Design a protein around this ligand. Structure first.
Ligand SMILES: [K+]
Ligand SMILES: [K+]
Ligand SMILES: [K+]
Ligand SMILES: [K+]
Ligand SMILES: [Mg+2]
Ligand SMILES: [Mg+2]
Ligand SMILES: [Mg+2]
Ligand SMILES: [Mg+2]
Ligand SMILES: [Mg+2]
Ligand SMILES: [Mg+2]
Ligand SMILES: [Mg+2]
Ligand SMILES: [Mg+2]
Ligand SMILES: [Mg+2]
Ligand SMILES: [Mg+2]
Ligand SMILES: [Mg+2]
Ligand SMILES: [Mg+2]
Ligand SMILES: [Mg+2]
Ligand SMILES: [Mg+2]
Lengths: 109, 139, 125, 201
RNA sequence: GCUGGGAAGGCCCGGCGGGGAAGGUGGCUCGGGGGCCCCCGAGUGUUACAGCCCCCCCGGCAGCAGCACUCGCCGAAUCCCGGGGCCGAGGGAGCGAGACCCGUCGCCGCGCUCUCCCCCCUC
RNA sequence: UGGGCCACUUUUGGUAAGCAGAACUGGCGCUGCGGGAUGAACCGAACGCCGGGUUAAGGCGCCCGAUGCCGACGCUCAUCA
RNA sequence: GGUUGGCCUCGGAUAGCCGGUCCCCCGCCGGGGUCCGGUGCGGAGUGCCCUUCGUCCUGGGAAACGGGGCGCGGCCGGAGAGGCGGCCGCCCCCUCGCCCGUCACGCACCGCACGUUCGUGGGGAACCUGGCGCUAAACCAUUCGUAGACGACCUGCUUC
């Protein structure tokens, strides 16, 4: 009955110009364009939800084609509202520029 | 073309910086970029202040340049700016913008209900006026 | 919100008439505390409403080792008549206080959602 | 965002607008830029024309049919400027470049839709008023573009139809304001709720 | 906490005063306006129908590197609380009963009892 | 191993040389890594396999991580900036 | 495989703008001149619109000049890529849907994730089911020589 998660974009991995650290990802959260506004989202669970070909078990539901790689926001990146996220598995590079959901689950408010 | 001028006694509204949201009076001007600034009734002590954070109002106080804070306060209190400011559309848009930001989830729900009814009553009457004005049969 | 239980889990009731949420446990780490409050002092939350009261129960799998005949019976969890009595007791004294101030039942009756305009960090709850 | 961003190119500086659009398409956003003939470039016109004429000179001496392709339409000129700010030789950059649609004038899909503006790339705020600038449409026309006149006539037709829409919109708004006055007794209850919370001052 | 035992500053119309002036108030003079009455510009000059600076014969009150965000260095002259992230390597610590169901153990910091009275809630 | 070469500075021949010859220290050779787009020698820093934090030199329109600061004060228009 | 409400549009100026109204001029609306407002844009994209728990008793308000029909039929506007938008006529149904209240109920699945939309998504074979419809070309081979290394190309082949 509602979106219940914030829209975020997987912009890329934490990196230098010529070195890429794939274990952590930089997320752009919609509406958060300054570093001082990223406090709310620190520690929040983030999910990369995608679909595949074969069915997989769904917790509390029939198996479907939806898969998910879970993660959480670790800290702020830069001065313009980017955040760094760690996922249980390094995000695939095909997801750059695609949707990441921020769950609001571990609420501190 | 210009109607609002930087001058001695001109009341300015602070848009950003440490004193954002306050009213100050211009006491003196320095080097085209900054001005001697004093708000004795708005809790801004005398200090330099860039012209970039100022937004000029329509209120001009009468006191000599670089006068002491006491005389600025007397001019500010007589024909008080605080009540005159609060009565302007400029200030009550600032206040309206403030209370909308502090609106809670329950208030958002009640506003959503009031806006729903208000729009349906208004938009009904618009249709009625349209339908009425549609009866134009004349050469 | 009624009380915190001995395990730290919160005991909540959304008056079951209003939003179909029974007397149920919940975790404070997975809720948003809004600023709107009702005075539920001098109401009596029954004493037996403890963690042991709300802890789940199971059937399988005694007297049965090799699974060839399904033991999927009982899966229809049954609402105990005691649970209905307790739900009726708490609601009978919380619902009147909800009706006291205007359009709170309608507020409890709706669900929370994120609209493409608003963002959670800008929201005051 | 998930919807298409339609940007009006009039009054926007070429490189500044291209930098914004380039990061948007790299973030998975679909961007449409219309009125690429209204894009401005800082510096007097003669100087900016010399820059493109120097671009025209760069060609493969052995076989110009393979060499740099010089596009004369303002939309393609802006398209190439964005392409210089994308990794267009990788699959990620090619995907981003395919999310950009550029047009001269405003075609029928977007003529009826509201058009956004990028203040950080606007000439009025980014350029000193005493400085000289060039119009991309004039620069394109005098270096090979062939459709400046027809685009002007079609843009003038579009503007005439837009004025009619604005008059109907204004007539509708006047009727709405009259409606609010008419039903004021049965509205003040909900007007007061809006005012207490900052809507409807 | 220190400093110029901070510098400025606020209030006490600061009061008895003195002096200086100018980014010159009032007044006056000259030049341009609105129905001989009211404005703008340029002169004059020392309070005037504004204000400014310095010295006082002396100050008083509050506050004090200010929760009116003007300008510092600090903490034996410094403590309390909260949030996010990553991590959990090690595995027989029992001088004691002569261990016996799995050493809740060492160092360190504490509380109560082997003293007696009261006080406040609660059964 | 007994072919060396390079850089700051001192320094001889030469118009000069990415030339030839010395002194001193460091380096490359034997050396990967961050930065200088690119590069034996420059700047930072030297290296077991990893996680977190922070930096150096260098950067933060876009490519391309970082200014998407309501940054400060000025200077500058170039028809080869 | 993505996605998890929409915005259906003045032209523009920036040492300026926006809105409204009476006379004048253009064949009943625009175009000007007064006049009145707003301008740190509130007729505001820092905005607006829609807003989803569902029903049952049950009153007060909004409406009642109402809603919804992949119901039909007709018409108009849109050509820059119109692939869209609007208006009537008839018909067929609800008095519901919007706000504030009364009244209880629904798996209340016993704290937990991929939930919630676009969506009757795109694409490819195939079965059944009704109506309305169609019955063609290309290439090779042959020929031509306006052509030609070979391909390719220009041509002809039961009718007056
Ligand atoms: K889905
Ligand atoms: K911590
Ligand atoms: K040897
Ligand atoms: K030897
Ligand atoms: Mg202090
Ligand atoms: Mg261990
Ligand atoms: Mg040898
Ligand atoms: Mg040798
Ligand atoms: Mg040499
Ligand atoms: Mg040699
Ligand atoms: Mg060697
Ligand atoms: Mg060595
Ligand atoms: Mg090395
Ligand atoms: Mg390198
Ligand atoms: Mg270089
Ligand atoms: Mg590291
Ligand atoms: Mg760089
Ligand atoms: Mg970047």
């Amino acid at each position: 009955s509602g979106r219940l998660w914030s829209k975020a974009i997987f912009a890329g991995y934490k990196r230098g110009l010529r070195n890429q650290r794939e274990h952590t990802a930089l997320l752009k959260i919609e509406g958060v364009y300054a570093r001082d506004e990223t406090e709310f989202y620190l520690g929040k669970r983030c999910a990369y939800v995608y679909k595949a070909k074969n069915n997989t078990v769904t917790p509390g539901g029939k198996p479907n084609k939806t898969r998910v790689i879970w993660g959480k926001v670790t800290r702020a990146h830069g001065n313009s509202g980017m955040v760094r996220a760690k996922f249980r598995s390094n995000l695939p590079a095909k997801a750059i520029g695609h949707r990441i959901r921020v769950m609001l689950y571990p609420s501190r408010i | 073309v210009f109607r609002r001028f930087v001058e001695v006694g001109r009341v300015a509204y602070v848009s950003f910086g440490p004193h954002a949201g306050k009213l100050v009076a211009i006491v003196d001007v320095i080097d085209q970029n900054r001005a001697l600034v004093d708000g004795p009734c708005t809790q801004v002590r005398r200090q330099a202040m860039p012209f970039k954070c100022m937004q000029l109002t329509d209120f001009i106080l009468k006191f000599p340049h670089s006068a002491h804070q006491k005389y600025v306060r007397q001019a500010w209190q007589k024909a008080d700016i605080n009540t005159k400011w609060a009565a302007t559309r400029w200030a009550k848009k600032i206040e309206a913008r403030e209370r909308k930001a502090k609106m809670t989830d329950f208030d958002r729900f009640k506003v959503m209900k009031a806006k729903k009814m208000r729009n349906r009553i208004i938009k009904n009457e618009v249709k009625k006026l349209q339908k009425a004005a549609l009866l134009k049969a004349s050469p | 919100f009624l009380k915190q239980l001995a395990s730290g889990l919160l005991l909540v009731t959304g008056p079951l008439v209003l939003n179909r949420v029974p007397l149920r446990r919940t975790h404070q780490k997975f809720v948003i505390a809004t600023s709107t409050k009702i005075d539920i002092s001098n109401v009596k939350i029954p004493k037996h409403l403890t963690d042991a009261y709300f802890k789940k129960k199971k059937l399988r799998k005694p007297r049965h080792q090799e699974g060839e005949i399904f033991d999927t019976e009982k899966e229809k969890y049954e609402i105990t008549e005691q649970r209905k009595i307790d739900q009726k007791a708490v609601d009978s004294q919380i619902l009147p206080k909800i009706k006291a101030i205007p359009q709170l039942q309608g507020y409890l009756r709706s669900v929370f959602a994120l609209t493409n305009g608003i963002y959670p960090h800008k929201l005051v709850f | 965002e998930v919807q298409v961003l339609v940007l009006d190119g009039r009054g926007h500086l070429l490189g500044r607008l291209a930098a914004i659009v380039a990061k948007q398409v790299l973030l998975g956003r679909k961007v449409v830029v219309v009125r690429c003939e209204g894009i401005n470039i800082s510096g007097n016109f003669y100087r900016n024309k010399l820059k493109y004429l120097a671009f025209l000179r760069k060609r493969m001496n052995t076989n110009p049919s393979r060499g740099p392709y010089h596009f004369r339409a303002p939309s393609r000129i802006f398209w190439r400027t964005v392409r210089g700010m994308l990794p267009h030789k990788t699959k990620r950059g090619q995907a981003a470049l395919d999310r950009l649609k550029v047009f001269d004038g405003i075609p029928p899909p977007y003529d009826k839709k509201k058009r956004m503006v990028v203040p950080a790339a606007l000439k009025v705020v980014r350029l000193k008023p005493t400085r000289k600038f060039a119009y991309l449409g004039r620069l394109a026309h005098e270096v090979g573009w062939k459709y400046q006149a027809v685009t002007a006539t079609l843009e003038e037709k579009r503007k005439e139809k837009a004025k009619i829409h604005y008059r109907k919109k204004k007539q509708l708004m006047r009727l709405r304001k009259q409606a609010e006055k008419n039903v004021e007794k049965k509205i003040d209850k909900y007007t007061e709720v809006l005012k207490t919370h900052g809507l409807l001052v």
